[PDB]
Tab-separated table of C-alpha atoms and ligand atoms in Angstrom:
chain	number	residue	atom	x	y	z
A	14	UNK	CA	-54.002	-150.774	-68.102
A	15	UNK	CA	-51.021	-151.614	-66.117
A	16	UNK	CA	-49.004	-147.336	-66.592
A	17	UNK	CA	-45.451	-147.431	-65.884
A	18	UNK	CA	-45.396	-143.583	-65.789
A	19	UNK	CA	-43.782	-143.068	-62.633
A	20	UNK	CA	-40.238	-142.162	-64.694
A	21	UNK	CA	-41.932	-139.174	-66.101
A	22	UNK	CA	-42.772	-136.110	-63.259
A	23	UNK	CA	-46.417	-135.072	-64.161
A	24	UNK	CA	-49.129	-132.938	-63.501
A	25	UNK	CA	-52.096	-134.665	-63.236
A	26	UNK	CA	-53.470	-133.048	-66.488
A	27	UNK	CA	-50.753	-134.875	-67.883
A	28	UNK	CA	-51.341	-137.756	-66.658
A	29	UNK	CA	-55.244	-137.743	-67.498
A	30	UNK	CA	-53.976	-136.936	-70.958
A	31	UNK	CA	-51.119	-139.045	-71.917
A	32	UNK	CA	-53.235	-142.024	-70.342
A	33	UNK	CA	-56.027	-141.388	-72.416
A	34	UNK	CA	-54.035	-141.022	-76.008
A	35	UNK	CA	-52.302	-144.951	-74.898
A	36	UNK	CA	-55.805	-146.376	-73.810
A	37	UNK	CA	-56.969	-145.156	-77.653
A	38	UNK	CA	-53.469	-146.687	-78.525
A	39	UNK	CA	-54.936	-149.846	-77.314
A	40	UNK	CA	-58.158	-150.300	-79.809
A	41	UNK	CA	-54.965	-150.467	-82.452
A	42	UNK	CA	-52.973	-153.343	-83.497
A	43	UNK	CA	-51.595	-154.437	-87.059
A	44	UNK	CA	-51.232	-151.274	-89.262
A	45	UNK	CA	-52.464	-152.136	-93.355
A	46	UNK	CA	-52.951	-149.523	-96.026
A	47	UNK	CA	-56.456	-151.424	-97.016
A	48	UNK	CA	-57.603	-150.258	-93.183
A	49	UNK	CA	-57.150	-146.314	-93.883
A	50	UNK	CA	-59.732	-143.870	-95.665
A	51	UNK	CA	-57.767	-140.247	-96.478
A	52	UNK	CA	-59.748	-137.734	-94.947
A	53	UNK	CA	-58.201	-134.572	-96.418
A	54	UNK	CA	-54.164	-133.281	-96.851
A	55	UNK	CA	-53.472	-131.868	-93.644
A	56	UNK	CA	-49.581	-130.573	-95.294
A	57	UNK	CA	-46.318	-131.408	-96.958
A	58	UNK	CA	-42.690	-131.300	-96.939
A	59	UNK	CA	-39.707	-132.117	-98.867
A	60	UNK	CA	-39.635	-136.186	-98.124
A	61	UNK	CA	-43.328	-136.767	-97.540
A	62	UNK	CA	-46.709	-135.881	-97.487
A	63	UNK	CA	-49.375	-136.072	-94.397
A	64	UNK	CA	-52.956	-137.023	-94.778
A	65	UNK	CA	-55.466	-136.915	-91.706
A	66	UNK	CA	-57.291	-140.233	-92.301
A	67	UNK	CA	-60.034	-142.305	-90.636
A	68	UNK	CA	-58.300	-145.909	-89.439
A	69	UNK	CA	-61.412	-147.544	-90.118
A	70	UNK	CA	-60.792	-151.041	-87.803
A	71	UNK	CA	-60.621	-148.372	-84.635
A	72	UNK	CA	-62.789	-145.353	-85.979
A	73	UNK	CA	-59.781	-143.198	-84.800
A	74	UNK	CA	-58.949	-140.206	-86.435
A	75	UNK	CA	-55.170	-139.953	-87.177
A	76	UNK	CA	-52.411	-138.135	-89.303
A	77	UNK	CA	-51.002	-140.271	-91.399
A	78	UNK	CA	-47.461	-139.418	-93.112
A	79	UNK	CA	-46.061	-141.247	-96.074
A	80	UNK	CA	-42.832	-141.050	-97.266
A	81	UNK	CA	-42.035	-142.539	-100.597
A	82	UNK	CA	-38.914	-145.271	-100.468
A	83	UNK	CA	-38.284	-147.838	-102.705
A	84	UNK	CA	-35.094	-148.889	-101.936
A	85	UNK	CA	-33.450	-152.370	-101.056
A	86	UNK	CA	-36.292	-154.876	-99.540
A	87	UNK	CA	-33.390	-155.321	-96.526
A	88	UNK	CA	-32.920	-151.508	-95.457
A	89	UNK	CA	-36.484	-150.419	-95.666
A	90	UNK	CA	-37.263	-153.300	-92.962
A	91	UNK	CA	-34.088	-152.055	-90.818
A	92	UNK	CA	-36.072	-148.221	-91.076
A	93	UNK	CA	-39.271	-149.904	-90.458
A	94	UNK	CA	-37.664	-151.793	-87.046
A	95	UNK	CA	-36.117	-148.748	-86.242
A	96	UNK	CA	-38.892	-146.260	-86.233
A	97	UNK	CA	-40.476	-149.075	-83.458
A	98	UNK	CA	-38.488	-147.706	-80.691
A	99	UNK	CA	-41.578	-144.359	-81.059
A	100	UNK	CA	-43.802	-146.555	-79.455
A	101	UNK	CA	-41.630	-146.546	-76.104
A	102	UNK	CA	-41.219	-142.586	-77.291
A	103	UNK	CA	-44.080	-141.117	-74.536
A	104	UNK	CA	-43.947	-138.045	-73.328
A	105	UNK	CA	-46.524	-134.570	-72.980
A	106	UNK	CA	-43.806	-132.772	-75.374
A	107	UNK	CA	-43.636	-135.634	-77.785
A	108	UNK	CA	-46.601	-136.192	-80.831
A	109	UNK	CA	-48.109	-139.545	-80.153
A	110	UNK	CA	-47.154	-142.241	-82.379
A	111	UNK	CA	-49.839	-145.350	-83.397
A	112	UNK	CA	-47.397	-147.052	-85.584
A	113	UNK	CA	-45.164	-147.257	-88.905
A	114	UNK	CA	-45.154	-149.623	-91.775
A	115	UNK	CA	-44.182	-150.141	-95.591
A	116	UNK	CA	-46.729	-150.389	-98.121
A	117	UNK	CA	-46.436	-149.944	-102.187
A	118	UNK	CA	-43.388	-147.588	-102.406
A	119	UNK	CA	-44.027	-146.045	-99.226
A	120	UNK	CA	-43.702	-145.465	-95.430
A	121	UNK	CA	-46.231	-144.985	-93.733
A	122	UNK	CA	-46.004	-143.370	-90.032
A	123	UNK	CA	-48.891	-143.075	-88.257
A	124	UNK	CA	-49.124	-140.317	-85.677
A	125	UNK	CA	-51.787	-138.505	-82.939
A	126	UNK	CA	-53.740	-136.011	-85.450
A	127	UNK	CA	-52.767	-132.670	-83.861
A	128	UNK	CA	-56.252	-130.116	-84.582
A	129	UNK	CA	-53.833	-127.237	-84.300
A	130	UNK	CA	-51.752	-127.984	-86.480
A	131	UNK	CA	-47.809	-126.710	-86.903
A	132	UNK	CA	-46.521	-123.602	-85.575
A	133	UNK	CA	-45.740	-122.690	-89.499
A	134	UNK	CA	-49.582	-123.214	-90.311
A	135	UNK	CA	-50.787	-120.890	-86.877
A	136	UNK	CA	-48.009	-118.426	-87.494
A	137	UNK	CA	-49.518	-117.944	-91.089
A	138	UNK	CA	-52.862	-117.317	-89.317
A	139	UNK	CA	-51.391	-114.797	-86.461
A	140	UNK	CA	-49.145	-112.778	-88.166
A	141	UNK	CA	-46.335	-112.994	-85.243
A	142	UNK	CA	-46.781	-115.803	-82.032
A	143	UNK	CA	-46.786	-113.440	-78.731
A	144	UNK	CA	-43.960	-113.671	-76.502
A	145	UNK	CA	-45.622	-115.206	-73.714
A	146	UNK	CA	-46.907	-117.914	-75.850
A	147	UNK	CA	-43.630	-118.339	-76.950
A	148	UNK	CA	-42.493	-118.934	-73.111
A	149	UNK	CA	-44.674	-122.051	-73.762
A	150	UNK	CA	-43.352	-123.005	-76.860
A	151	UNK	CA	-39.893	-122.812	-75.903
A	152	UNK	CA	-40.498	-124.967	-72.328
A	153	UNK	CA	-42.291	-127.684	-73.909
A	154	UNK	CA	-39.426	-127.672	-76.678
A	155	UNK	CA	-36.551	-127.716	-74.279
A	156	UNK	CA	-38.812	-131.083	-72.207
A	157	UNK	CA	-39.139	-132.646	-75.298
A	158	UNK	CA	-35.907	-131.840	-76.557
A	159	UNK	CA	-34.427	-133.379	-73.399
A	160	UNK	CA	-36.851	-136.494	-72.674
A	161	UNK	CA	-35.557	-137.465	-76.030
A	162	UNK	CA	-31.621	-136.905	-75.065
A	163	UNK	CA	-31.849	-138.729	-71.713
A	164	UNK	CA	-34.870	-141.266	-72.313
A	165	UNK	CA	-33.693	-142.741	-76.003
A	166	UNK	CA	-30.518	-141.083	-76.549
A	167	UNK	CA	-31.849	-139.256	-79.260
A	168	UNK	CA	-31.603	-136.122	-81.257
A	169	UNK	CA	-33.918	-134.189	-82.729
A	170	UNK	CA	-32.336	-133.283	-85.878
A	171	UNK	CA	-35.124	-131.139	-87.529
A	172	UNK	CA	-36.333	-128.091	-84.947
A	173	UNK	CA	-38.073	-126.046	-86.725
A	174	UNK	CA	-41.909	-124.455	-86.381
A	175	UNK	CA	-43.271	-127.189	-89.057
A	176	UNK	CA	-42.055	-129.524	-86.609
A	177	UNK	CA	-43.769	-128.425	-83.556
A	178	UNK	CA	-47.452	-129.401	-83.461
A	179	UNK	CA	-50.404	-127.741	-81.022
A	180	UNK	CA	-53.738	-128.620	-80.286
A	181	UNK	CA	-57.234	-127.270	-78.937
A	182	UNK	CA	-56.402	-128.627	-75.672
A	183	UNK	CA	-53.369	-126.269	-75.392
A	184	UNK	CA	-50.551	-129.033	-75.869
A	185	UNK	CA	-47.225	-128.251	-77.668
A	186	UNK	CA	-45.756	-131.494	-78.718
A	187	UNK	CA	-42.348	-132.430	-81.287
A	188	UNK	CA	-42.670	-134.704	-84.260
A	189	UNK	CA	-40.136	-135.736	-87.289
A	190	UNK	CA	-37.295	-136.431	-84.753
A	191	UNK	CA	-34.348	-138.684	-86.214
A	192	UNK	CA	-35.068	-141.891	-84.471
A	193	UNK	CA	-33.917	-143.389	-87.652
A	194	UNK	CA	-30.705	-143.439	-88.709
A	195	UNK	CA	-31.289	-145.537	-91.047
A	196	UNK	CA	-33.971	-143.375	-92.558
A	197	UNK	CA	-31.732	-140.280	-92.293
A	198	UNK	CA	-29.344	-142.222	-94.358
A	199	UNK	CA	-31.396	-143.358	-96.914
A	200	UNK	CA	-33.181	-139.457	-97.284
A	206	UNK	CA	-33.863	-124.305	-99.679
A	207	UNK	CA	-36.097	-120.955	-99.170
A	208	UNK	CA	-35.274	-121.100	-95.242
A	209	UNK	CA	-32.969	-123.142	-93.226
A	210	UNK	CA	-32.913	-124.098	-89.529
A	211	UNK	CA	-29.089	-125.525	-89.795
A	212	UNK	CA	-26.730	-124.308	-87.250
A	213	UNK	CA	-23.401	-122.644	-88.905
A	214	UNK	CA	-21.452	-125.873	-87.524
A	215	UNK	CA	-23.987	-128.781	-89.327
A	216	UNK	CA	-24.060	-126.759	-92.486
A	217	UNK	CA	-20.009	-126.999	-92.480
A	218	UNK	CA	-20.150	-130.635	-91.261
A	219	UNK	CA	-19.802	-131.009	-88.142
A	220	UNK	CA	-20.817	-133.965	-86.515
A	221	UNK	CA	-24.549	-133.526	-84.925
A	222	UNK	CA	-25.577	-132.601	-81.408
A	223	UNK	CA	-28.044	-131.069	-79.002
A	224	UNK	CA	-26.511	-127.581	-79.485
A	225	UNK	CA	-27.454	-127.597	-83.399
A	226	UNK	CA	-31.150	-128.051	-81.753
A	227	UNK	CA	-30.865	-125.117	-79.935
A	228	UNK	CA	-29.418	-122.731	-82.504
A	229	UNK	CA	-32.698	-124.253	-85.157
A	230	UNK	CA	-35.312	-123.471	-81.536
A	231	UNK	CA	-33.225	-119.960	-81.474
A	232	UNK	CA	-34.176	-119.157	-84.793
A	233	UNK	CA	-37.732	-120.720	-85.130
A	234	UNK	CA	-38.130	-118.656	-81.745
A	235	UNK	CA	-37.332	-115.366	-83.356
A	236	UNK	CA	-39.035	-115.845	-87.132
A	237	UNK	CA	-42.841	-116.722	-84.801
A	238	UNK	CA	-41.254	-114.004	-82.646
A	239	UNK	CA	-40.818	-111.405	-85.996
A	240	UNK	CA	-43.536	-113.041	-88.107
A	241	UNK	CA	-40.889	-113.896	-90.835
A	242	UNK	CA	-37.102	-116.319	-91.683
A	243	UNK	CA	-34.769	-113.473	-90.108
A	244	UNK	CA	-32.416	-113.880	-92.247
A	245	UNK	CA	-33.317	-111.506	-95.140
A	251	UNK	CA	-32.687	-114.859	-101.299
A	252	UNK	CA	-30.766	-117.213	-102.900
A	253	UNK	CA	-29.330	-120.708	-101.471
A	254	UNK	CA	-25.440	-119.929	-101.310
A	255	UNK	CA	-26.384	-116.486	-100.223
A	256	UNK	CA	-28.682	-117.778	-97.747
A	257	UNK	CA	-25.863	-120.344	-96.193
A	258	UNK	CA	-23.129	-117.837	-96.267
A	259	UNK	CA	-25.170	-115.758	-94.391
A	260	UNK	CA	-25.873	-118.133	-91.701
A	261	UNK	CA	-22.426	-119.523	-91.682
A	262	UNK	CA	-20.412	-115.943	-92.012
A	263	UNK	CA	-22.672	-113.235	-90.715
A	264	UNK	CA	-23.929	-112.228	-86.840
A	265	UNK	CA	-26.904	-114.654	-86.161
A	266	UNK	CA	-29.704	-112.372	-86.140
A	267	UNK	CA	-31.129	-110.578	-82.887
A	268	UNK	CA	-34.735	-110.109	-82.083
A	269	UNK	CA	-36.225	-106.068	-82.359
A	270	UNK	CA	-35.445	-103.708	-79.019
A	271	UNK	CA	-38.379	-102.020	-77.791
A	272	UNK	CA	-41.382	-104.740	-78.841
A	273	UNK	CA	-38.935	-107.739	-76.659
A	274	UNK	CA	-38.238	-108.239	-73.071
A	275	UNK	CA	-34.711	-108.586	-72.559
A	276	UNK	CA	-34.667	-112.097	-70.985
A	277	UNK	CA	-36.455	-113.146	-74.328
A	278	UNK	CA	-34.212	-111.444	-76.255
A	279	UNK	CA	-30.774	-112.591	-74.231
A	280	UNK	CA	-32.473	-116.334	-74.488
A	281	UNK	CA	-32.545	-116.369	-78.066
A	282	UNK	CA	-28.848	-114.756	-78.412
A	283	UNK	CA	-27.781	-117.971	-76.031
A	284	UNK	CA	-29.825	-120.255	-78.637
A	285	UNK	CA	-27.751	-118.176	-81.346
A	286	UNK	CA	-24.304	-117.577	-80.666
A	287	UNK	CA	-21.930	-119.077	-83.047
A	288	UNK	CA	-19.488	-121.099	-81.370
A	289	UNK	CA	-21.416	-124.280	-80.055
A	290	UNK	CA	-18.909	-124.499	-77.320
A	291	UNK	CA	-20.183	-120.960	-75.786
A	292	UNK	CA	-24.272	-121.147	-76.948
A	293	UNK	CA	-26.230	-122.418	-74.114
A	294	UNK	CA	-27.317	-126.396	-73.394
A	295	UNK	CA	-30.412	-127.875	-72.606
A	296	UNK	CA	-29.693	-127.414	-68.476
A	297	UNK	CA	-29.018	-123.439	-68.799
A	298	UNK	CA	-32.078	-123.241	-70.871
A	299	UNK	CA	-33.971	-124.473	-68.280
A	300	UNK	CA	-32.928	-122.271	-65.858
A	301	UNK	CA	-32.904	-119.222	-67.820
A	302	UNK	CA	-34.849	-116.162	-66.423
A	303	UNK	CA	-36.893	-116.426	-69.961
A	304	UNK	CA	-38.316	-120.066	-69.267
A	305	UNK	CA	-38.677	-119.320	-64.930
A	306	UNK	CA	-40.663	-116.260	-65.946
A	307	UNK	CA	-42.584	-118.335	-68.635
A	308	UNK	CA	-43.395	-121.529	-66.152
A	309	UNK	CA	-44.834	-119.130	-63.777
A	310	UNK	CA	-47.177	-117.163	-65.993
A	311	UNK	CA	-51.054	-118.395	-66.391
A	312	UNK	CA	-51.187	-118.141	-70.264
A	313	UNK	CA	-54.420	-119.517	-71.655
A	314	UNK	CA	-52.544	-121.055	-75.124
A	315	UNK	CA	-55.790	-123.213	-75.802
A	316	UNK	CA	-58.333	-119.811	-75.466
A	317	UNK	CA	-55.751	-117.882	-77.745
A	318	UNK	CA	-54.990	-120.885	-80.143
A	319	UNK	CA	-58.521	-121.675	-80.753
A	320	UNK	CA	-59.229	-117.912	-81.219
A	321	UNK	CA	-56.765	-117.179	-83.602
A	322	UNK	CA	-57.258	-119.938	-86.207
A	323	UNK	CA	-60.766	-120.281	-85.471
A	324	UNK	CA	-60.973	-124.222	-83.918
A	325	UNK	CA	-62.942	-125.507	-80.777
B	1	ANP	N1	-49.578	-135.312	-86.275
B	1	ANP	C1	-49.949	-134.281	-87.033
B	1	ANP	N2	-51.156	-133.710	-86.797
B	1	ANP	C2	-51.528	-132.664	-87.547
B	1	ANP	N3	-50.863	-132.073	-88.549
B	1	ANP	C3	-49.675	-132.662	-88.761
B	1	ANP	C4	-49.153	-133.743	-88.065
B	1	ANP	N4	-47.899	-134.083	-88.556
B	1	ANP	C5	-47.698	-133.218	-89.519
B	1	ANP	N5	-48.728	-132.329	-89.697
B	1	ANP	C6	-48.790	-131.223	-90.643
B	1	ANP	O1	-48.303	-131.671	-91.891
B	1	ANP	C7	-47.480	-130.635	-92.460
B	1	ANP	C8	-46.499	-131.248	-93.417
B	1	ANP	O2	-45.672	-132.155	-92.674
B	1	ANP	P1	-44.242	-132.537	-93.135
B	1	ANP	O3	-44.327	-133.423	-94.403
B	1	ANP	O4	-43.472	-133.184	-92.059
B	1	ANP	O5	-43.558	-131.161	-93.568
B	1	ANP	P2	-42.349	-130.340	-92.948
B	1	ANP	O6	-42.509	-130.412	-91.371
B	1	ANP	O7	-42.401	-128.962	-93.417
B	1	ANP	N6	-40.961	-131.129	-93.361
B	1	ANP	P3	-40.069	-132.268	-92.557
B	1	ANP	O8	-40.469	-132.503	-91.178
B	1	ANP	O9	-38.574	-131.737	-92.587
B	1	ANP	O10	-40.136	-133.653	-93.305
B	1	ANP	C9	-46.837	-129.961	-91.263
B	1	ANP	O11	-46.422	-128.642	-91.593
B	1	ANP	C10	-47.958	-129.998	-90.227
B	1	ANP	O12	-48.751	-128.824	-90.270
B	2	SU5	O1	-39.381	-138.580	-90.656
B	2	SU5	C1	-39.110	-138.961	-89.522
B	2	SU5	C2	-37.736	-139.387	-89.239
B	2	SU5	C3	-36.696	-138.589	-89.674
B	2	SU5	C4	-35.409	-139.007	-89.418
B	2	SU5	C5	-35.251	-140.197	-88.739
B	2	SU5	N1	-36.234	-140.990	-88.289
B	2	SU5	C6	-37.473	-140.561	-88.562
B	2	SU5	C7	-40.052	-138.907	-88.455
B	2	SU5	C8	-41.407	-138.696	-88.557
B	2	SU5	C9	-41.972	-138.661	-87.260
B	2	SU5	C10	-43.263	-138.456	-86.796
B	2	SU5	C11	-43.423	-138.467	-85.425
B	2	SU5	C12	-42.367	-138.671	-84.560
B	2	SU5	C13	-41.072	-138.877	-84.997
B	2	SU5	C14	-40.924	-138.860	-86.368
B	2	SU5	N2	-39.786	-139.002	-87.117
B	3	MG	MG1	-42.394	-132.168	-90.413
């Protein structure tokens, strides 16, 4: 394999790792429904369902979502182009992606099988996420966050805990990113929605970092903080103080992190750059957390 990595500043775990998942990439060509056996449901959501399957031409094990679409012959093939661009879409912070395709009423995008599952799933499991493993969280959300903005000029569109996938090998990597507008075209309890998107306004990074804010502070608090019914919900989020994580359980960089994630105005809440500086994230990147000992311990894995 000829790696064209160089654009990407690694460790060399990193490098091991992301060269391994694209020489597995490599035993995989054509994707066909008639090549997959469904394993077992690993979860759902509101447009799709995800299946870890066997792909039996490769043997590899992988998570297979399907998202039911029948629509015009014309625009599902402009989705099905569009969601292409994930195989240029590598990166440590970013779920690995084998391929997508159309098949009986459905799309089919095949992804890296993640053995940790979502941060939802684990925070079920652990009650609340530690800070300091939230320091991880929060770096490798701000990478991915930004390899997508300044690699493929994309946004993420859908932070939220379902969305960020871990593994026994301690990685913390983003999936369900809108890298189709198309498919965001054609497309309750708790919502992730900064005040501004719910209103209208048109999307950027900063509605990313309000939804990390508050997925930061529910795995923080071990519940949605805001708490119900839908309107009551929305005006809450749209007309009330964003909410603040507890005094005396927090450390105050954490907590002044999250209330730059949170405030309000989009103009005054912190961007991807003063995220990365932050005291919360410097403090994080130095610490010598052991996220695959504690992952694997707490759901019971490897
Ligand atoms: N690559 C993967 N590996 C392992 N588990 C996965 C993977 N992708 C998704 N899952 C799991 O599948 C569950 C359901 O996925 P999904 O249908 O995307 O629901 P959702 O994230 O709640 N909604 P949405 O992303 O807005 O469409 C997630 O909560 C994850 O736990
Ligand atoms: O559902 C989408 C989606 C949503 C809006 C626009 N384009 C695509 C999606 C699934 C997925 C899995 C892995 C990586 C990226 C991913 N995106
Ligand atoms: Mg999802």
């Amino acid at each position: 394999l000829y790696f064209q990595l160089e654009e990407l500043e690694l460790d060399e775990q990193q490098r091991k790792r992301l060269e391994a998942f694209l020489t597995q990439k490599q035993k995989v060509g054509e994707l066909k429904d008639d090549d997959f056996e469904k394993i077992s449901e690993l979860g759902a959501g509101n447009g799709g369902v995800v299946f870890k399957v066997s792909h039996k031409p490769s043997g590899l094990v992988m998570a297979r979502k399907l998202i039911h679409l029948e629509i015009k012959p014309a625009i599902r093939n402009q989705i099905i182009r569009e969601l292409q661009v994930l195989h240029e879409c590598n990166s440590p912070y970013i779920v690995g992606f084998y391929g997508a395709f159309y098949s009986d009423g459905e799309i089919s995008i095949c992804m890296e099988h993640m053995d940790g599952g979502s941060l939802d799933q684990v925070l079920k499991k652990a009650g609340r996420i530690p800070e300091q493993i939230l320091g991880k969280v929060s770096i490798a959300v701000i990478k991915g966050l930004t390899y997508l903005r300044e690699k493929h000029k994309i946004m993420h569109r859908d932070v939220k805990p379902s969305n960020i996938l871990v593994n026994s090998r301690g990685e913390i990597k983003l999936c369900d990113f809108g890298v189709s507008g198309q498919l965001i075209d054609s497309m309750g309890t708790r919502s992730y929605m900064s005040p501004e998107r719910l209103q209208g306004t048109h999307y950027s990074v900063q509605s990313d970092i309000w939804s990390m804010g508050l997925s930061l502070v529910e795995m923080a608090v071990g519940r949605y903080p805001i708490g119900m019914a839908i309107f009551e919900l929305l005006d809450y989020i749209v007309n009330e103080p964003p909410p603040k994580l507890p005094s005396g359980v927090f450390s105050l960089e954490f907590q002044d992190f999250v209330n730059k994630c949170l405030i309000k105005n989009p103009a005054e809440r912190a961007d991807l750059k003063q995220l990365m500086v932050h005291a919360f994230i410097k403090r994080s990147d130095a610490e010598e957390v052991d996220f695959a000992g504690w992952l694997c311990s707490t759901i019971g894995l490897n």
